[PDB]
């Protein structure tokens, strides 16, 4: 019954080091450390979380590992390294045995994602990660999903986790169903690969949070949850809060509640257990 928040961040805030924290995101412009996450998780009966890199650099990985060293309720860390470096194996050696369970690059920020993932040096590193049972978290915008389809097919030796369900363009759902249909087609192409699993996190901030979440936004999010459910199946879905980023749109309790309401209506008891931590535990190999 292990319950896990599979996607959250920590930071000591410095503006220049967090360029993605921009205008209208003032709520994020402060420190978010384990002490602040504690009571949020207790309130939702989540026993542990997985801390994920919030900026590029070895020092982010070192930072998260130090936090994880001292807090039992951080079960794992998804870090950052230069996966193209031939010295990757030797740079990672000091982390073997620790809570480090995977890596993520911010692929969404690359100008040509297809070219990036096909780089020989990059492919070598990802190959090395998989041979050593490291997970890789895939982070892209929905339109970039075709750009990584073949990358995912090739690297089928260990688990790949799709962050935020592929970031459906929820702010565009209002016009018509084109955005849902486009994203859903690409999602299904990735979901057909059995080594790919899906994080149900980060949806409230893909909606137009600036104007404030609306009833329609909740309905649209439910369309995406259903779609992810249909494509991946209940055993490849994991809850994640995306705290503190989620706070742009909703409180930690509202994020959890939204998922729990959907889950209780769609899923069996056993399937809920997988969503709420069983899937995270097995993909990230959590004790
Ligand atoms: Zn506590
Ligand atoms: Zn293996
Ligand atoms: Zn193969
Ligand atoms: Zn609508
Ligand atoms: Zn196909
Ligand atoms: Zn529905
Ligand atoms: Zn995030």
Q: How far is Cα 34 from Cα 222, in angstroms, rounded to an integer? A: 30
Ligand nearest to the CA of 190: 5
Residues 157, 64, 273, 223, CA torsion sign: negative
Q: How far is Cα 245 from Cα 36, in angstroms, rounded to an integer? A: 13
**Region for 235 from its dihedrals, namely left if φ exceeds 0, alpha if ψ lies in -120 to 50, beta otherwise:** alpha
Which residues have beta carbons under 5 A from ligand 6 (an ion)?
A: 222, 226
Residue 169: which of 183, 189, 190, 188 has the closest Cα? 183
CB 140 within 8 A of CB 108: yes
Q: In what order do the strands lie in the sheet with 48-52?
A: 4-8, 48-52, 74-79, 100-104, 135-138, 160-162, 196-200, 237-239
Which residues have beta carbons under 5 A from ligand 7 (an ion)?
A: 242, 245
- Residue 279 sits at the vertex; the CA angle it makes with 152 and 228, to the nearest 5 degrees, is 60
- List C-alpha distances in Å: 181 to 27, 143, 174, 177: 33, 12, 13, 6
Q: How far is Cα 169 from Cα 206, in angstroms, rounded to an integer? A: 6
Q: Distance from the CA of 181 to the center of ligand 6, in angstroms?
A: 15
Q: Distance from the CA of 161 to the center of ligand 3, in angstroms?
A: 17
Q: How far is Cα 200 from Cα 239, in angstroms, rounded to an integer? A: 5
Residue ranges in 44-177 assigned as alpha helix (H)? 58-70, 88-92, 113-118, 120-131, 145-154
DSSP class of 116: H
Q: Resolution, rounded to a tenth of an Å?
A: 1.9
Q: Distance from the CA of 176 to the center of ligand 7, in angstroms?
A: 27
Q: Distance from the CA of 186 to the center of ligand 5, in angstroms?
A: 9
Q: How far is Cα 11 from Cα 33, in angstroms, rounded to an integer? A: 6
CB 252 within 8 A of CB 170: no
Ligand nearest to the CA of 226: 6
Task: Give exposure, 46-74, as e/b (b: 16+ Cβ within 10 Å).
Answer: bebbbbbbbeeeeebbebbbebbeebebb
Q: How far is Cα 34 from Cα 243, in angstroms, rounded to an integer? A: 11
Ligand nearest to the CA of 7: 7
Count the neighbouring beta carbons within 10 Å of the beta carbon of residue 200. 25
Ligand nearest to the CA of 42: 1
Q: Which residues have CB under 8 Å from 279's CB, separation 6+?
A: 197, 235, 236, 237, 238
Between helix 215-232 and helix 252-266 the angle, nearest 10°, is 50
CATH 3.20.20.140 fits 1-287, yes or no: yes
For the chain, the domains span 1-287
The distance between the two most distant Cα atoms of the chain, rounded to a whole number of Å, is: 51
The rounded radius of gyration (Å) of the Cα atoms in the chain is 18
Q: How was this structure determined?
A: X-ray
């Amino acid at each position: 019954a292990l319950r896990i928040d599979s996607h959250q961040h920590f930071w000591r805030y410095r503006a220049a080091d967090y360029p993605w924290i921009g205008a209208g995101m003032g709520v994020l412009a402060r420190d978010y450390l384990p002490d602040a996450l504690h009571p949020l998780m207790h309130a939702q009966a989540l026993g542990a979380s997985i801390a994920v890199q919030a900026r590029a650099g070895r020092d982010e990985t070192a930072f998260l590992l130090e936090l994880a060293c001292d807090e039992a309720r951080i079960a794992a860390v998804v870090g950052w390294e230069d996966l193209r470096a031939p010295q990757l194996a030797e740079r990672v050696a000091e982390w073997r045995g620790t809570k480090l369970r995977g890596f993520r690059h911010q692929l969404q920020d690359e100008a040509d994602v297809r070219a990036f993932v096909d780089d020989a040096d990059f492919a070598r590193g990802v190959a090395w990660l998989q041979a050593n049972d490291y997970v890789y978290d895939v982070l892209v915008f929905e339109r970039q999903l075709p750009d990584v389809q073949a990358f995912c097919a090739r690297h089928d030796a260990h688990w790949l986790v799709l962050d935020h369900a592929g970031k459906p363009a929820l702010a565009e759902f209002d016009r018509d169903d084109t955005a849902l249909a486009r994203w859903r087609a690409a999602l299904r192409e990735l979901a057909a690969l059995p080594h790919v699993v899906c994080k149900l996190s980060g949806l409230v901030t893909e909606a137009d949070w600036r104007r404030g979440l609306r009833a329609s936004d909740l309905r649209h999010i439910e369309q995406c949850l259903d779609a992810a459910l249909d494509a991946f199946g209940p055993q490849r879905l994991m809850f994640g809060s995306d705290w503190p980023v989620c706070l742009l749109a909703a409180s930690y309790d509202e994020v959890a509640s939204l998922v729990e309401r959907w889950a209780e209506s769609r899923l069996s008891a056993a399937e809920r257990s997988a969503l709420w931590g069983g899937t995270a535990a097995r993909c990230y190999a959590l004790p």
